Design a protein around this ligand. Sequence first.
Ligand code: FES
Ligand code: FES
Ligand SMILES: [Cl-]
Ligand SMILES: [Cl-]
Lengths: 76, 76
Amino acid sequence: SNARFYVKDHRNKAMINLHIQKDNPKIVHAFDMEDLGDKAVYCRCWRSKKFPFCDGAHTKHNEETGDNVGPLIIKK
Amino acid sequence: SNARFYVKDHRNKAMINLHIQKDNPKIVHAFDMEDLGDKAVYCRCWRSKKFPFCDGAHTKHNEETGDNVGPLIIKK
Ligand code: FES
Ligand code: FES
Ligand SMILES: [Cl-]
Ligand SMILES: [Cl-]
């Protein structure tokens, strides 16, 4: 292996969110359980066109970057 | 401005999650509302020592990377 090709362990510099609500300095969503339906599927990858809800965009992120992120599900 | 210093718009290559459950190919958490307390604060930045719960680690991520991510709150 040629070590000159490898980026050694380092403190992350890359953003997670690239586009969503970029005039908001810290994006938080807060929901009351009363308002939720039977199931809500929330995005944790910041790629969904339906953010804060998951639309399956994580599958593209994971395949493209080698990551393993997925949504948070709250069900009733 | 010296344009030679600027990385032009491009499709993301960087991972979001760097360390959590890396033997899991797609990390999903699912909770029943019945089991939730008055308030649950869920991490969307993949930096929390208490993942899937938010412990405020997002503030370090945001300051270090210039990002603007934050948690998802479900309250009852
Ligand atoms: S689209 Fe982001 S977690 Fe599914
Ligand atoms: S620690 Fe990740 S969103 Fe707060
Ligand atoms: Cl996936
Ligand atoms: Cl912050």
